[PDB]
Nucleic acid binder design. Structure first.
Lengths: 103, 201, 125, 64, 86, 207
RNA sequence: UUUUUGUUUGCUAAUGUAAAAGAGAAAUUAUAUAUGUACCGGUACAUAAAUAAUCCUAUCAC
RNA sequence: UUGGAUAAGGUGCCUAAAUAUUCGCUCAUGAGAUCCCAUAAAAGGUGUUGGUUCAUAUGAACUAGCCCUGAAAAUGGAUGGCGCUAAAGCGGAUUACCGAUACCAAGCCAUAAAAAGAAGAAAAAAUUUUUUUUUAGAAUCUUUUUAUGAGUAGAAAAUCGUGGGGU
RNA sequence: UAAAUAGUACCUGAAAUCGUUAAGAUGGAACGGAUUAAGAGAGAAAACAAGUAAAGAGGGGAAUAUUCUCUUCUUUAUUAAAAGAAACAUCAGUGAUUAAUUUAAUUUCAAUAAAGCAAUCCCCUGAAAUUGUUUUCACUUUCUCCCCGCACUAAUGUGGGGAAAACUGGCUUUAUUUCUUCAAUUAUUUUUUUUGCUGAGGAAUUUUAAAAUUAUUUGAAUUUUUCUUCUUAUAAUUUAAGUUGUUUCUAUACAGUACUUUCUUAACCCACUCGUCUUGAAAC
């Protein structure tokens, strides 16, 4: 009906990480229908929006977005690394991101 | 992973593989509901797994067994404990992941009327060579002290009868819809019919 | 984490605190190098109270200037503000704490007609 | 630099001087990794150390 | 002198020709050799292949001799083993 | 004007140099030492008649028709207002998914492509840039809400350079209206908004 | 219980989300086979066997 | 510090990365599972899998892989845990991947060393005339360059403060 | 009384410790490091607007108790500009990705359509007669025929024993390689798709010169030309000689729900009690 989406859904997994060590400059993101490195390479360079709600208004709006970008793939199973303007908080692990169709 | 909730028919799955897949899904944030936990399979003979559970039962804090490892005998709880062992349950995020999981024996009222999914990388039929021994979780639980196996079985046969009635009605409705569609396919304009025929509709 | 405001890089904020000053009242937070023997912080164990080191030093092209890209100069009367007559673009002024209200007003007006910015311009008024 | 290249490749009259004039190369880690630095290249198991003969070229290319 | 960006001496054409005064000539020659028309090669492939029949025969002969030598070693070792069986 | 090191022909265009820095010792100077820059080099699948999908504006998901390459890299686009409500809009190419269908590949529409090009050869970026004076007037009203919205609309309408845009919009839309309408399925295609269903995987589907 | 507006002396108007973007999908079972139908577990006939690699659902405003 | 790529080691979950690919072996009514390392032997097996040498597809005798017996301890318990048998075990092989404060490129701080040094207008904005910035020269200093940076005991330098005294 | 929160324990009045109010957290410690997020406090000195015209208050300097000039505030309208950020683009440095590619070497193959050769035979391969050489049979497909079991099979067939040519397979001659093949490895070269991160510096006598490129120009050379090379001169450019441009937003504000910052709370990962003697301390 209304509110076209034209973006691919993704989920914020943890940070770029080893066992017992974190690199919260990158975020691991899982994209909806991608399960392979070759397919994940497709959405490289696309902008990513972490859109989330907030208890009280900040510009007359209850919603704000953390902007980032897909930088490269991660592993073999279509997980990507995203670099955001600011490190997304670990409270957002498991939340939804938009892999936008632009650029 | 991207659904509001995934209902998994645990019949015929291997316990450890099912638990691993469920644990990863819960940590990634997917709510899953595991039904028919009494039909989970474990590789290895029933006697061997019974010995394993006896070793587990012999385990308790000798100063106060109330504090000890709570053993739990319902197969749904056995699956829940396995998933928890595959999980970082002592952190806040791990606890959230653990509490995103619901386990049932049989198929209760909401979940008997929703689509049940299956994990191919955890069916016994795909993961065990036929000439090797396995056990049924409900049977192990009954030998260990659950004594609700037969009740779940009869509830399941009643549910299967209800489901068969539903399936007959659904098949008849599908045939009726197919006939209506095939009649209507000659009433649309030939360009639309041609497009549908070309793309397989 | 580094913060950048234009050309100004502050390689670190949240200044270093003395080890165990959080959980001992007699230990003030002012940094002291832990001399110690099995001292954790001195040995640089992971996840505790890192020590300052010269590597954190800020770029010397922008080392001492304020968020207004100007070096602070503290003045006590109107006669200490003469050098700024030909440094007004790279120095900002700050009136010393123990300066009375008349000298404060005089300093503010002289700085304004020298168009030298004042940091604590609204104090004692 | 082409004179440098010639003298290095063909161990010509001026090799010691060119080689000494040249700062020691600082190579990157190999793109696909090593096999096992512990074991010889000539061991039947995967290994890396020892004389690689012409096989040094692909390793250098991955390390460059 | 102030340190500037170190240009890629391989892909930055101006600095590559600065370093190697012969490189632009060599590269133009290679490109011009590349630009030859496919008709000549298509029409001369058989001419350029049929010259090597004698080399192929000699090659077959040397590999045949090597295989025969290996087989004769096989036979000699088998004969010796049969000798020492009794 | 161009340069073709390694056989490339990058094509140069002039650049103004407005950023100013301070010199090391005495003066100030313009930082940019270059007078020419290599130009956009747009995507290959971008043609004049192609139908594209807008991704970002208030017309996200809307389908439009490419009109002109605007000498700055951005391209003018018209989702012909008479059929779609998408105005003559200058859109960045990389906020736009260009499909594989060209409007001028239809038999009835290919005839008037030359008329289309004649109409379109007078669009320019300055006519798209907001004029300083009308911007001032529009911000004046900020010192109820429906009234100020309507006044802003009216000021934009009275912009002396939006009027020429409205005129060329109107004539190009009148030029393309009948032939587009007579392709019944294609007219609905242009009028319908592109959305991403959960059965379409965009790393596998074609633009 | 339904509609409109809102949650921009210690208080007496008042907001929170671990996860909306089509969060779409109820048969059962076997895995060296199953499922439906019709007769008396058996017989016969159909169906299914990359099965979600599917289907269903979206824009035609006034 | 920002990127990149790796080492050791890993890629079923805990836990980032393979329920990867390819070929064998193993069923354990106390299987097994990363050097140091967290014990196991003599002696056995008509368990199974390959080899060897004698016997007119038979019978033997050997051999060595995995498995089994030999194999008993005190709070309840530990391949790290869950668990795993079309392995997530054992022996290989092929790839991809993940993975350091190490490596690479770049920035900045300091240390060491080095190259060098004891006077003139640049731009911009207004309107030919104005306006705005700057227009440098401290030798333990100024500009630029390269490499380098653990540290107890111990040593030194440069800095930061306190009482009081001259100026 | 200037002041009593200077009231005789009387100047100031710290910390430990306790009270009131408010805000928050709260599943067998608490605190912490690192990174953000949400709240709550503060804040404009960079975090927009210099000037211009008017009227109101003032202050100074020069000009012989009067003219010009400078300036600061209050208000109005009256216009710039700049700065930060974002997006896109360009260039450069450094990576990731996906398509290729010239010329050679290495027993490559494999097809097309007309002939021919051999038949347990052929490219092969095998078993047999102070080095070579020579020889024998034994090696294939059948959706062929015959016999026996004659339905016996895993089988829409089959087991055992024989005959057959020659489809299949192998070899030779000719023409072809876009019907089809042209591989793999290595040496030697040339490109290309989509993309991440970074932008030090600011050159008053080297950001020059050279190099490259473009447009004319002189001659030559040669791989013989729409990127062929070498210089002759001029003019420009940048691929040289470390990031620039455009458009928006902040915003036509004076401090807010924005931005900066402190604090308080969470959350992911990490984190044993310091001092000390000691080889070795979180130490029962």
């Amino acid at each position: 009906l209304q509110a076209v989406r034209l973006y691919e859904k993704g989920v914020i997994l943890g940070y770029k990480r080893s066992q017992r060590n974190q690199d919260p400059n990158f975020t691991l993101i899982s994209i909806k229908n991608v399960n392979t490195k070759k397919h994940a390479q497709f959405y490289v360079g696309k902008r990513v929006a972490y859109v989330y709600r907030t208890t009280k208004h900040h510009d007359g709006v209850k919603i704000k977005c953390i902007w980032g970008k897909v930088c490269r793939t991660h592993g073999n199973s279509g997980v990507i690394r995203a670099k955001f303007k600011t490190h997304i908080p670990p409270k957002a692990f498991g939340d939804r991101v938009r892999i936008l169709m632009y650029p | 992973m991207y659904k509001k909730e995934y209902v998994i028919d645990c019949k015929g799955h291997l316990l450890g593989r099912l638990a691993s897949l469920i644990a990863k899904e819960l940590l990634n944030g997917q709510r899953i509901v595991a039904v028919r936990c009494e039909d989970i399979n474990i590789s290895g003979s029933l006697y061997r797994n019974k010995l394993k559970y006896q070793e587990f039962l012999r385990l308790r804090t000798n100063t106060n067994p109330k504090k000890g490892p709570l053993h739990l005998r319902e197969p749904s709880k056995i699956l829940w404990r396995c998933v928890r062992g595959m999980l970082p349950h002592k952190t806040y995020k791990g606890q959230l992941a653990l509490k995103k999981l619901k386990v049932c024996v049989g198929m209760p009222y909401p979940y008997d009327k929703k689509k049940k999914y299956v994990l191919p990388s955890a069916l016994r039929a795909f993961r065990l060579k036929k000439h090797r021994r396995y056990c049924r979780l409900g049977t192990l639980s009954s030998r260990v002290g659950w004594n609700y196996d037969t009740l779940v079985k009869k509830n399941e046969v009643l549910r299967k009868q209800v489901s068969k009635a539903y399936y007959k009605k659904k098949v008849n409705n599908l045939n009726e819809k197919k006939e209506i569609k095939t009649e209507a396919l000659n009433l649309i304009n030939p360009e639309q019919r041609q497009v549908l025929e070309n793309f397989g509709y | 984490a580094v913060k950048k405001v234009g050309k100004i890089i502050k390689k670190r904020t949240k200044k270093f605190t003395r080890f165990q000053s959080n959980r001992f009242m007699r230990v003030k937070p002012a940094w002291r190098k832990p001399r110690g023997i099995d001292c954790r912080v001195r040995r640089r164990y992971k996840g505790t109270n890192l020590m300052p080191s010269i590597g954190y030093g800020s770029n010397k092209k922008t080392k001492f200037l304020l968020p207004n890209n100007k070096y602070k100069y503290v003045v006590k009367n109107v006669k200490e503000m003469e050098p700024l007559i030909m440094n007004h673009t790279k120095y900002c002024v700050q009136i010393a704490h123990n300066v009375s209200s008349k000298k404060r007003k005089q300093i503010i007006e002289r700085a304004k007609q020298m168009n030298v910015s004042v940091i604590n311009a609204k104090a004692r008024l | 630099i082409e004179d440098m290249v010639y003298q290095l490749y063909t161990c010509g009259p001026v090799f010691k001087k060119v080689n000494n004039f040249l700062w020691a190369f600082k190579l990157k880690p190999p793109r696909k990794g090593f096999k096992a630095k512990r074991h010889a290249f000539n061991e039947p198991r995967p290994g890396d150390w020892g004389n690689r003969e012409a096989h040094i070229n692909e390793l250098i290319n991955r390390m460059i | 002198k102030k340190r500037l960006q170190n240009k890629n001496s391989l892909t930055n054409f101006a600095v590559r020709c600065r370093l190697n005064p012969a490189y632009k000539l060599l590269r133009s020659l290679a490109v011009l050799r590349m630009r030859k028309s496919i008709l000549e090669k298509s029409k001369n492939k058989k001419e350029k292949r049929v010259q090597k029949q004698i080399q192929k025969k000699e090659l077959q002969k040397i590999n045949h001799d090597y295989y025969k030598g290996v087989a004769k070693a096989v036979k000699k070792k088998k004969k010796r083993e049969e000798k020492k069986a009794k | 004007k161009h340069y073709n090191v390694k056989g490339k022909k990058k094509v140069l265009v002039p650049v103004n140099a407005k950023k100013t820095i301070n010199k090391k010792y005495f003066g100030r100077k313009v930082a940019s030492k270059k007078k020419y820059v290599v130009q956009r080099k747009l995507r290959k699948s971008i043609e004049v008649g192609k139908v594209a999908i807008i991704l970002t504006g208030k017309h996200m998901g809307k389908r439009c028709i490419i009109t002109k390459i605007l000498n700055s890299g951005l391209l003018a686009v018209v989702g012909p207002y008479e059929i779609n409500g998408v105005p003559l809009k200058r859109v960045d190419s990389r906020y736009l998914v260009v499909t594989s269908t060209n409007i001028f590949n239809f038999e009835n529409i290919a005839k008037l492509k030359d008329d289309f090009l004649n109409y379109a050869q007078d669009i320019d970026d300055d006519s798209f840039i907001k004029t300083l004076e009308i911007k001032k007037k529009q911000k004046k009203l900020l010192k109820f809400m429906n009234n100020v919205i309507d006044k802003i609309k009216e000021i934009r309408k009275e912009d002396p350079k939006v009027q020429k845009l409205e005129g060329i919009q109107k004539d190009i839309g009148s030029l393309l209206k009948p032939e587009i309408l007579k392709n019944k399925v294609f007219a609905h295609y242009l009028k319908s908004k592109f959305t991403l269903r959960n059965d379409m995987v965009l790393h596998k589907m074609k633009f």
